[PDB]
Scaffold this active site. Structure first.
Site, PDB file in Angstrom:
ATOM      1  N   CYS A 266       0.415   6.788   2.358  1.00 20.33           N
ATOM      2  CA  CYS A 266      -0.486   7.706   2.712  1.00 20.33           C
ATOM      3  C   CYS A 266      -1.993   7.202   2.491  1.00 20.33           C
ATOM      4  O   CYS A 266      -2.931   7.703   3.337  1.00 20.33           O
ATOM      5  CB  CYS A 266      -0.384   8.724   1.504  1.00 20.33           C
ATOM      6  SG  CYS A 266      -0.339   8.500  -0.297  1.00 20.33           S
ATOM      7  N   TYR A 267      -2.173   6.290   1.717  1.00 21.89           N
ATOM      8  CA  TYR A 267      -3.450   5.895   1.518  1.00 21.89           C
ATOM      9  C   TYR A 267      -4.050   4.978   2.685  1.00 21.89           C
ATOM     10  O   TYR A 267      -5.072   5.040   3.382  1.00 21.89           O
ATOM     11  CB  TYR A 267      -4.003   5.126   0.355  1.00 21.89           C
ATOM     12  CG  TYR A 267      -3.780   5.601  -1.103  1.00 21.89           C
ATOM     13  CD1 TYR A 267      -4.948   6.422  -1.423  1.00 21.89           C
ATOM     14  CD2 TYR A 267      -2.705   5.436  -1.992  1.00 21.89           C
ATOM     15  CE1 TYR A 267      -5.099   7.089  -2.659  1.00 21.89           C
ATOM     16  CE2 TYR A 267      -2.923   6.245  -3.267  1.00 21.89           C
ATOM     17  CZ  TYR A 267      -4.067   6.883  -3.523  1.00 21.89           C
ATOM     18  OH  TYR A 267      -3.961   7.328  -4.772  1.00 21.89           O
TER      19      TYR A 267
END
Lengths: 344, 347
Positions: free
Chosen positions: B153-154
């Site tokens: 996600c990051y």
């Protein structure tokens, strides 16, 4: 018998000043009395209507902010942190202790002031951050205090010992998350709970935030190098607290950077260096005048990382005002100011 | 192309697994019966009904969660794996080689075995097409693939904020990323640190100074668009929201803003899930929540000679299950945007 006025008593900073004045030991034994409470609109209301937590003061009437009404006190807090109190301040006895929460007297460079604030430079007063090198001596017996911005407080405490020791490069990056009380009490759509809850956003990015030059200034006082500051503020769904992640290039070992922090902070009552393998969190400092700081080295990225947590309304605002007031008056510096957070 | 899919979801009781199910339920192939939702597995709590873990997914609330075993998972055209690292490596061996495997885990993400071993302490399993269609060359690897490694996600946020500037050679290859994340990004395993009472009202950096496992993924995706050597200072920050990543990404530059802007417009102007903010507007995670979009703004801090890029995504949608379903559509030959809204559920 110290009599204190609070101008801007109805904002978040003035209410926090008032909270800390009520728990102060000088208020307890009568050395300190709370006098006029002033705001710009809603003169005639009681303080209870702005600040329902401050029940001992709920019956006080908010007076209009005028030089004469602030006259007749020994200390005057002007809590317009987004205000511009240079006017009020020039009409008060040079023997009245003035603690300005605003920016009017923070910056030492007039060219910078004009550029960022679009007005005439009022001058500069002793910066109310006692932990910065040489700041505490300026503050002892002073009758004038410019309280630092919330963000400069967190970033300066994260970075200054590394930079002073010449252990990092003078180009710094700061990304600091903050609760919404730091934006103040103005009824804007972008500050409504339905808008802010559940959501995060950077604002005033790439250099436009007026705290950028404040951070530069603080760091330039501990180095001869040209300092550059990338500062990004991020609003997060909390009412209080700033968590500042501060970075700069370094080629120094972790053990040397750690010693520079122990050295600067070992005797600072409000600075807590995290134990080995612990990191700051803003919930641990809420409602306390403490700063929790951890440092680290990212070897692959050649990057120094300092993390500082503060309560934006205590160490970042009113606790700093009260700390510096203690100093200006010859009282114990930690009087009325706890290091213990109200958590969870 | 694909005229039908029977789909299994392993790790169905986690956050990513539950978000995959939400998106599948609302997917048009589900509505016209071309997509059937088959086996739902979790190693933990096998025997419970889905409703006990995910009360929002009422149409599936009666489904019994089965053990995560290759025999339960076999017989499906497509299998989503939302499992801890190492698990999918084993599972991929055991499932038919012709199954579409969409791996939400980390096992097949990294292309350097030494980097993998360093951050994970296990044998490198290999590397599959990285399920971020918007990166240069990625869409060509995903069209018709039977293998997908879903991005973390990051890196999704940091990659979408920074690749265009770096691909155009307009920023230095040394980047800093400070990204604030909702707590769903930390997973659904109950620890003291992730309790409501500790998270609510609090923010903390964690896994700082290069130790976060997403750090090499950002470096890898950046190295794929430049011939320079890339360094990444990545700091992740947990915040009191359940969803959303706001990535603040900086690198030194001497390029005028007008040139940077032009590179982003060129990159994203025809990307359905990327909204490059009109100049003077900034992203907020609240605007992307529940959608498969990324909102991006860029600017230059002249005094600091620093390029600043802000990206907002839903960590569970474009950062995880949306990325998976978007890549599944490509893999299947269905319209890339099927099942995937650009419209956030705000406020």
């Amino acid at each position: 018998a110290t009599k204190v006025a609070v101008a801007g008593a109805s904002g978040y900073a003035g209410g926090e000043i008032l909270r800390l004045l009520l728990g102060h030991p000088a208020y307890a034994d009568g050395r300190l009395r709370i006098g006029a409470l002033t705001a710009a609109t809603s003169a005639g209301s009681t303080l209870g209507e702005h600040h329902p937590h401050l029940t001992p003061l709920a019956h006080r009437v908010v007076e209009p902010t005028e030089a004469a009404v602030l006259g007749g006190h020994d200390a005057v807090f002007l809590a317009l942190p987004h205000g511009h109190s240079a006017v009020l301040a020039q009409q008060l006895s040079p023997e009245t202790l003035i603690i300005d929460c605003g920016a009017d007297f923070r910056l030492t460079d007039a060219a910078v002031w004009e550029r960022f604030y679009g007005s005439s430079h009022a001058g500069s007063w002793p910066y109310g951050l006692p932990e910065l090198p040489g700041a505490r001596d300026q503050l002892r017996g002073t009758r004038r205090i410019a309280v630092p911005g919330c963000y400069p407080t967190a970033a300066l405490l994260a970075l200054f010992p590394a930079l002073a020791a010449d252990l990092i490069e003078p180009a710094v990056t700061v990304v600091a998350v903050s609760g919404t009380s730091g934006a103040g009490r103005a009824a804007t759509t972008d500050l409504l709970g339905a808008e802010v809850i559940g959501s995060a956003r950077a604002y005033n990015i790439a250099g436009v935030h007026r705290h950028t030059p404040e951070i530069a200034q603080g760091l330039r006082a501990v180095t001869d190098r040209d300092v550059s500051v990338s500062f990004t503020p991020v609003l997060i769904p909390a009412s209080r607290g700033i968590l500042a992640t501060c970075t700069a290039r370094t080629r120094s070992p972790l053990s040397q950077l750690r010693a520079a922090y122990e050295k600067a902070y070992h005797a600072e009552p409000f600075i807590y260096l995290m134990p080995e393998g612990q990191l700051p969190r803003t919930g641990a400092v809420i409602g306390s005048n403490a700063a929790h700081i951890a440092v680290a080295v990212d070897e692959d990225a050649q990057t120094f990382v300092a993390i500082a947590a503060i309560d934006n309304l205590v160490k970042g605002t009113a606790g700093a005002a009260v700390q510096s007031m203690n100093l200006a008056l010859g009282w114990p510096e930690t009087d009325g100011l706890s290091v213990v957070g109200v958590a969870p």
